[PDB]
Amino acid sequence: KQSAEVVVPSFKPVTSPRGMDMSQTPLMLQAMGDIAEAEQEVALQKPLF
Amino acid sequence: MQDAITSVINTYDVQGKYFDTSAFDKLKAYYATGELRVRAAGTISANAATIIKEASAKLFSNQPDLVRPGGNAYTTRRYAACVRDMDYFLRYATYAMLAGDTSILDERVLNGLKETYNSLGVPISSTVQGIQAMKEVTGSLVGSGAAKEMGVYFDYLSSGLS
Amino acid sequence: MQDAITSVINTYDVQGKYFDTSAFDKLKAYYATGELRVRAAGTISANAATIIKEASAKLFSNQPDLVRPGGNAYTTRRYAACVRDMDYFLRYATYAMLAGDTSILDERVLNGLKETYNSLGVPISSTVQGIQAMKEVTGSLVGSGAAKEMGVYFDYLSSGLS
Amino acid sequence: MQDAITSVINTYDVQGKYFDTSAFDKLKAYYATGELRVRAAGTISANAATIIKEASAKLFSNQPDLVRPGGNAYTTRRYAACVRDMDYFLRYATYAMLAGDTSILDERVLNGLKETYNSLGVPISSTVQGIQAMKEVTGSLVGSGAAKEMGVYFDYLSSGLS
Amino acid sequence: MQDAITSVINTYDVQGKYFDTSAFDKLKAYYATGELRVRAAGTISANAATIIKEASAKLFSNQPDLVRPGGNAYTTRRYAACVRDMDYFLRYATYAMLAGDTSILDERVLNGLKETYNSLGVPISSTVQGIQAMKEVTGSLVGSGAAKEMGVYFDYLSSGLS
Amino acid sequence: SVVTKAIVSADAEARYLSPGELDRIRGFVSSGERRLRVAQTLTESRERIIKQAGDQLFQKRPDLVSPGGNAYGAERTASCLRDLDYYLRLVTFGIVAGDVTPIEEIGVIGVKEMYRNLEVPLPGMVEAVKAMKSVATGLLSGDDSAEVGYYFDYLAGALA
Amino acid sequence: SVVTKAIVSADAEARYLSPGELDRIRGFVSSGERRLRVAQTLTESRERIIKQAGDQLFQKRPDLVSPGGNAYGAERTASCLRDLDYYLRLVTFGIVAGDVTPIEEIGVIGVKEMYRNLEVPLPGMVEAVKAMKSVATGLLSGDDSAEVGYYFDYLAGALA
Amino acid sequence: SVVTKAIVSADAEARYLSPGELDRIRGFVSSGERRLRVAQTLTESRERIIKQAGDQLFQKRPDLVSPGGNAYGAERTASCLRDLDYYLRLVTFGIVAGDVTPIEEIGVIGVKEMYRNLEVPLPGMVEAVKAMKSVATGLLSGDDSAEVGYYFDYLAGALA
Amino acid sequence: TRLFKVTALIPSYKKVRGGRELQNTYFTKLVEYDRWFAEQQRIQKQGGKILSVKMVAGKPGLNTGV
Numbered sequence A: 001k002q003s004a005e006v007v008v009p010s011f012k013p014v015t016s017p018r019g020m021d022m023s024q025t026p027l028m029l030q031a032m033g034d035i036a037e038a039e040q041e042v043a044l045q046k047p048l049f
Numbered sequence B, C, D, E: 001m002q003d004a005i006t007s008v009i010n011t012y013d014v015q016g017k018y019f020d021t022s023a024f025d026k027l028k029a030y031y032a033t034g035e036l037r038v039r040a041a042g043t044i045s046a047n048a049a050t051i052i053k054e055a056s057a058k059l060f061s062n063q064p065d066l067v068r069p070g071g072n073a074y075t076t077r078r079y080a081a082c083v084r085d086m087d088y089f090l091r092y093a094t095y096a097m098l099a100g101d102t103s104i105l106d107e108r109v110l111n112g113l114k115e116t117y118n119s120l121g122v123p124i125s126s127t128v129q130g131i132q133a134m135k136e137v138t139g140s141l142v143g144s145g146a147a148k149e150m151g152v153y154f155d156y157l158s159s160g161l162s
Numbered sequence F, G, H: 001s002v003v004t005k006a007i008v009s010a011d012a013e014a015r016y017l018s019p020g021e022l023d024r025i026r027g028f029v030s031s032g033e034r035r036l037r038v039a040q041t042l043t044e045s046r047e048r049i050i051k052q053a054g055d056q057l058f059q060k061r062p063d064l065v066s067p068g069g070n071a072y073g074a075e076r077t078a079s080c081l082r083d084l085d086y087y088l089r090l091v092t093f094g095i096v097a098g099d100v101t102p103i104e105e106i107g108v109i110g111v112k113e114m115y116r117n118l119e120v121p122l123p124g125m126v127e128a129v130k131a132m133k134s135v136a137t138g139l140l141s142g143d144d145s146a147e148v149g150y151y152f153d154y155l156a157g158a159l160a
Numbered sequence I: 001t002r003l004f005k006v007t008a009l010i011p012s013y014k015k016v017r018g019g020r021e022l023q024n025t026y027f028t029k030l031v032e033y034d035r036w037f038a039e040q041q042r043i044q045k046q047g048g049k050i051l052s053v054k055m056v057a058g059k060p061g062l063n064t065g066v
C-alpha cells in the first residue's frame, strides 16, 4: 500500500516515428540505383523500333 | 515489431490505400538490399565472440578504471554482465539491420535502458564508447557498404543511450 | 469498495458515535431508492450487449473517422478494445449505481486511465463522447427515475476522464 | 478547338501510346452520349430565339436599371448588341456541348473578353446573370439529361467571365 | 516428439552406426512426399471447422443417443468438450502427417488420454466412430494420397483409444 | 513479414539467426519480385474482384440481403462490399509481406468481437472470402493462384 | 474529327449546325463501336504489322537497306520501322476520329520538308505505307479492311 | 528438425501451421536433397577425416599423447579417436536434420560434466573439433564447406 | 467430477540439474477438473509420461454439481 499508482500503464507504441525515413540510407540509395539498371535492361529487352 | 515491409504496409494501412508505384519501388529497394543484409548478418553471427572480445578490449584499455577494483565492471559478475550487454547490443543491431528498421531498437533495447543503467550506476558514456568500439570492429568484418549500414543501427543505439 | 450504507457506517465509526437520526435518515433514503436501483440494474443486465451496440454505433456515426483507416478504433483489434472499454464503463457504472457510491469507479476504473490512454494515444475526448453515448442509451432504457441516478455515475466517469 | 475524341487522341499522342482499354472506355463514353448531344443541339437551335427572349426578359426584369437611361443596355443599338452577345453565348455553349469539351469556349469566346467588357463598359456580373438565366431557360427545353450537360458549359462561360 | 528424419537419426544413433544407403533412401522417401504433406496440411487447416462440423454431424446422426439426455455428449458443456476433443484429434493428426511419424500422437495425444476417458466414462467406441468420421470427411477433402496418409494417423488414434 | 518472424523466433531463443533462417530470408527476398507482381495484379483488378465476389456471395447466400439479413439495404450492402475491399487489401499486404502477419494484426485479432458487436454472421464472412478466393485465383496463373489461395484460406479459417 | 469539322464549318458561317451536319454526327456516333473494334484489332497486332510491313518493304526495296540506303544498319532500320509505327498509330487515331484529321495534323503537314532534311526518299515512304496497308487490311474483315484502306490511301497520297 | 520446431511452435499457440511455416517446411524439403548429398560425402570419408584429424590434434597437442596425458596409451588414444568418430557421426546427423538439435541432444548436454569426470581437457576437445572441421571442409567443395563448418563451429562453441 | 488424482513421471531432457529433482519427476497430485486439460497438456509438452489418472471426489456422468 505504498502507492496506488500504476507502474506500467501501457507501453508507448513504436509503430511510426517522426522523420528519419531511412530512404536516404546509402545502401537503400544503392538499391534505388540498381533498380534503375534493371528497368533499363527490361527496356532494352523490347524491340528496337 | 516492424521491418521495411511492415513499415510500408503500415503507412499504406493508415491511409486505407492499396499499394501505389512508390510503395512497390520501396519494396523493390528492400528486396534488392536483402542479399547484402543476409550476408552481413551471417558474417556478424559467425564472428560475434571475436567482436565482443575486441570491443571490450578497446573499451577496457581506454577506461581501465572500469576493471580496477571498485569499477563498475570489476567483479566476475559485473564483467560478465558487461560483455553480455555488449552481446545484446550486437544481436539487436544485427536484427535491426536485417529488418531494415530501427523500431526493434526502441522497442527491445532502448526502452528503459537509460534509467536501468542510472539505477545500477552503469556509466552510460562508457557504454556508448563500447558501442562505438563494437561498430569499428564490425565495420572491418562486414565490408564498406555493410559497414555504413551497420553504423546506422549502432549510432541509433548510441544516440538513444546518450 | 464502499457503498452508501458502508459510507454512513464509516463516517460514524471515525467519530465513534452510535447512529443518530441523520444517519438513520440517510439509511432510509438509500433503502427507499434500493428497489429502483435493483430494477435498473436488472434492466441493464438484460440489455447490456444491446446498449453497447447502440452506443458504439452512435459514437462511430458522430465520429466516423475513429473507425475509418487512421482512426484509433480502426482495426479489428482496436475496435474490439474500444468495445471492451465501453463494457468496463457500463458494468462499473451499474455497480456504482447499485452501490449508491462512486468509490468503485475510483478504485477499479479511474485510477490510471489517463496514463494508459495517453500512453496508447487513445483520444480521451472521444472516449468521453462514447461514455455520453452510453449515458443517453442507458437512460432511455432504464426510464425517467433511474436515468437521473445513472447519469450521476456516467458523468462522474466522464469528469474523471476529463 | 478539340472535341472529346481528339482530347483523348492528344493525351495518347503526347505519350506515344496506342489506345488502352481506358482510352477505349472514354471513346465509348463519348459515343454513347452522341445521340443525346445531337438531340439537345437540335432542340437548342430550334429554340434559340425563344431562349434569348426569355433569358433577356428575365435579366431586364431582375436588373431594370440596365435598360434605363444611362444603363449599358440603354439604347436600341446597345440593347441589340446585348441580345447579340447572348446569342453568341448560347451558340458557343451549343458548340461546346456537341464537342464534349470546353476548348472552343476558351479560344473563341473567353479569350480577352474580360478586358473587352471592361473597356466597353459592359457589366460583367450582369452578363453572368444573363448566362445563368439562359442556362435555366435552356434546361427546361432540353430535358434533365441534356440539361445537366448544357449546365457544364454555361458554368464554364460564367466562371471564365466571373 | 520426433519426425521421420529425427526418427531415422535416433534409430541409427541407438546402434551407433552411420547412415547406410537405406537410411538415405528413407530420407529421400520423406523429402519426396513432403510437398504433398504441405498441401494436405494447408487444406486441412483451411477447413478444420468444416471437417469437425461434418464429422460431428455424422457421429451424432449415427449415434443419436449421445446428445439426447443421458448421453455422454448431453449438455452444452459436454458437447463442447466432445467437439474440442475432435478438434484436437484432427489438428494433432495433421501434425503427425506433416512430421511423417506417429510419435507426437504418443507424446501429446495418447499420453494419458485412455485412462482420462476411462475415469470420465467417455465411451471408447463412440470416440473411435468420431475419429473414423473425421477420417472419411478429411480424405474426401484432401484427395487419394493425402487421404491414405491422414488415414494412417487416424487409425493410429483409433487403435490407441481401442 | 518473413524477416519479422525469423527475427522474433531468434529473439525468443536469445540467439542469432541460423543459416537455415537466413536461407529462408534469402529465398523470400528472391521471390519478392514475383510477390510484387501478384500484388499488383490483385490491386489493379480490385473493383472487379469486389463486384464479382459480392455477386457470388449474394447468389450463394440470399438471406444476407433478404429482409432480416445483415446486408439488407443499399447502405448495408455498401458496407459489406467495403469490408470485402478491406480484406482484399489485407490479402495483398500479406502477399508482399510473405506471411499472414499483416492480415492477422489488421483484420483477424478481435474480429469475432467486432462482428458480434456489429451483428455480422461469420459464416457470411467465410462465404464472402471464399467468393473472393474463387474470383482472385481466376485472375492468376496456377503457381501464383495457389499462393494467393493460401492467404485466402487462412482468412477463411480465421473467420471460421 | 467529324464533330470538330462540322462545328468549325458552322462556326465559320456563324450559325448553328444544320440538320445535315447533325445527321452526319449522328451517323458517326452510331458507327462508333465497329470502328473502335477495328482500332482495337490494329492495336493488338501492332508488332506483327510492323514486322511484316518492314519485311515486305525491304524485299520490294532492297536499296533502302543496302549500303548507301537511308535505312542501312540496325539503327536506321529501327528508325524506319519506328516511323512505320508512328504512322500506324496515327491511322488508329484517324479510325476512331472518323476522319484523317489526326493523321494530317501529326504526320502530313510538313512531311516533305522533314523527310528532305532526313534524306529519306518519299517513294520509299509510299512503298512502306502500301506494305502496311496490305498487311493491316489482311487482318480485318472486308468492310473494315476497306475502311482502313481508305486511311492508308490518304497517307500514301499525302506522301506521294 | 525444422519440421519438429515448426510443429512445436504451432502447438504452443494451439494453432495450425501458418502459410509462412508451411512455406518454411517447403524450403526445408527442397534443400533436403543437397543435405543428404553432403551427409553422404562426409559419411564416405569416415576414416580419412578421423585419421588426419587425429594426426593434427596429436602433433598440435603432443601433451595429450605424452606421458601423463589423458590419451596416453594405445587404448586411450583409441578412445580419443572413438570420441572423434562419435562427433563426426553427430555432425552428419546435424547435416541431415538441418539443425544442431541432434548434436545438442546426443553430445552437448552435460558434456562438460562428462569430460570433467573423465579428466578430458576441454581445449583438447576444441582443437580436435577444429581439426575435424578443417579436414571435412577440405574434402568438400566451396558450397558444402560453409554449412558443414557451421555445425563444427557450434560443437566447438559448446565444448568451449 | 471436480478432482483427478494424477500420477505422472516427468523426465529431464533440456539439462542435468544440480538439484536432486527426485521431487519433481515422479509425482502424484490432485488437480481439479477444469484444470486437468491444461495440466495434461503441459505435462505432455514437457515430455512426461502420464502413468495414471483416477476419479476421487466427484461422480462421472453427473450433470449438476459440477
Ligand SMILES: CCC1=C(C)/C(=C/C2=NC(=C\c3[nH]c(/C=C4\NC(=O)[C@H](C)[C@H]4CC)c(C)c3CCC(=O)O)/C(CCC(=O)O)=C2C)NC1=O
Binding pocket: B060, B067, B068, B073, B074, B075, B076, B079
Ligand atoms: C576480482 C575478480 C576479477 C578477476 C579475477 C578479474 C580478471 C581479469 N584479468 C584480465 C586480463 C588478464 N588476465 C590474465 C591471466 C591469465 N594469463 C594466463 O593465461 C593465466 C592462465 C591466467 C592467470 C593465472 C592475463 C594474461 C590478462 C591480460 C590479457 C591481455 O593482455 O590481453 C582482465 C582484463 C582487464 C585488466 O587487465 O585490467 C580481468 C578483468 N577481474 C576481476 O574483477
Ligand SMILES: CCC1=C(C)/C(=C/C2=NC(=C\c3[nH]c(/C=C4\NC(=O)[C@H](C)[C@H]4CC)c(C)c3CCC(=O)O)/C(CCC(=O)O)=C2C)NC1=O
Binding pocket: C060, C067, C068, C073, C074, C075, C076, C079, F064, F070, F071, F076, F077, F079, F080, F081, F083, F084, F086, F087, F106, F107, F118, F120, F121, F123, F124, F125, F128
Ligand atoms: C481492416 C479491418 C476492419 C474491418 C474488416 C472492419 C469492418 C467494419 N464493418 C462495419 C459495418 C458493416 N459491415 C458489414 C459487412 C457484413 N455484412 C454481411 O453480412 C457480410 C457477411 C459481411 C461482409 C462480407 C455490414 C452490413 C456493416 C453495416 C452494419 C450496421 O450498420 O449495423 C464496421 C462498423 C463501422 C463502419 O461501418 O465503418 C466496421 C468497423 N473494420 C475494420 O477496422
Ligand SMILES: CCC1=C(C)/C(=C/C2=NC(=C\c3[nH]c(/C=C4\NC(=O)[C@H](C)[C@H]4CC)c(C)c3CCC(=O)O)/C(CCC(=O)O)=C2C)NC1=O
Binding pocket: D060, D067, D073, D074, D075, D076, D079
Ligand atoms: C431610347 C431608346 C429605347 C427604346 C425606344 C426602348 C424601348 C423598350 N420598351 C420596352 C418594354 C415595352 N415597350 C412597349 C411599347 C409597345 N407596346 C405597344 O405595342 C406599342 C405599339 C408600343 C409603344 C408605342 C411595351 C408594351 C413594353 C412592355 C413589354 C413587357 O413588359 O412585356 C423595353 C424593355 C424594358 C422596359 O419595360 O422598360 C425597352 C428597352 N428602350 C430604349 O433604350
Ligand SMILES: CCC1=C(C)/C(=C/C2=NC(=C\c3[nH]c(/C=C4\NC(=O)[C@H](C)[C@H]4CC)c(C)c3CCC(=O)O)/C(CCC(=O)O)=C2C)NC1=O
Binding pocket: E060, E067, E073, E074, E075, E076, E079
Ligand atoms: C440442455 C442443453 C442442450 C441443448 C440446448 C442442446 C441443443 C442441440 N441442438 C442441436 C441441433 C439443432 N438445433 C437447432 C435450433 C436452431 N435452429 C434455428 O437456427 C434457431 C436459431 C435455433 C432454435 C431456436 C437446429 C436447426 C438444429 C439442427 C442443426 C443441424 O442438423 O445441422 C443439437 C445437435 C444434435 C441434435 O439434433 O439434437 C444439440 C446438441 N443440446 C443440449 O444437450
Ligand SMILES: CCC1=C(C)/C(=C/C2=NC(=C\c3[nH]c(/C=C4\NC(=O)[C@H](C)[C@H]4CC)c(C)c3CCC(=O)O)/C(CCC(=O)O)=C2C)NC1=O
Binding pocket: E066, E072, E073, E077, E078, E079, E081, E082, E083, E085, E086, E088, E089, E108, E109, E113, E116, E120, E122, E123, E126, E127, E130, I001, I033, I034, I035, I036, I037, I038, I040, I041, I060, I061, I062
Ligand atoms: C490433447 C489431447 C487431449 C484430449 C483429446 C483430451 C480430452 C479430455 N476430455 C475431457 C472431458 C470430455 N470429453 C468428452 C468427449 C466424448 N464425449 C462424446 O461422447 C465423444 C464420444 C467423445 C469425444 C468425441 C466429454 C463429453 C467430456 C466431458 C466429460 C464430463 O465432464 O463428464 C477431459 C477432462 C478435463 C476437461 O474437459 O477440462 C479431457 C482431458 N485431453 C487431452 O490432453
Ligand SMILES: CCC1=C(C)/C(=C/C2=NC(=C\c3[nH]c(/C=C4\NC(=O)[C@H](C)[C@H]4CC)c(C)c3CCC(=O)O)/C(CCC(=O)O)=C2C)NC1=O
Binding pocket: H064, H070, H071, H072, H076, H077, H079, H080, H081, H083, H084, H086, H087, H106, H107, H114, H118, H120, H121, H123, H124, H125, H128
Ligand atoms: C555420443 C556422445 C558421447 C561422447 C562424446 C562420449 C565421450 C566418452 N569418452 C570416454 C573415454 C575417453 N575419451 C577420451 C578422449 C580425450 N583424450 C584426450 O584428452 C583428447 C583431448 C580427447 C579426445 C579428442 C579418453 C582419453 C578417454 C579415456 C578416459 C580414461 O580411461 O581415463 C567415455 C568413457 C566410456 C568409454 O571409454 O567407452 C565417454 C562416455 N560418450 C558419449 O555417449
Ligand SMILES: CCC1=C(C)/C(=C/C2=NC(=C\c3[nH]c(/C=C4\NC(=O)[C@H](C)[C@H]4CC)c(C)c3CCC(=O)O)/C(CCC(=O)O)=C2C)NC1=O
Binding pocket: I011, I012, I016, I017, I020, I021, I022, I023, I025
Ligand atoms: C537425491 C536423491 C535423488 C536421486 C539419486 C535421484 C536420481 C534420478 N536419476 C534420474 C535419471 C537418470 N539416472 C541415470 C543413472 C543410471 N543410468 C545408468 O544406467 C547407471 C547404471 C545408472 C547410475 C549409476 C540416468 C542415465 C538417468 C537419465 C534417464 C533418462 O534418460 O531419462 C532422475 C530423473 C530426472 C533427471 O534426469 O535428473 C532422477 C530423479 N533423484 C533424486 O530425487
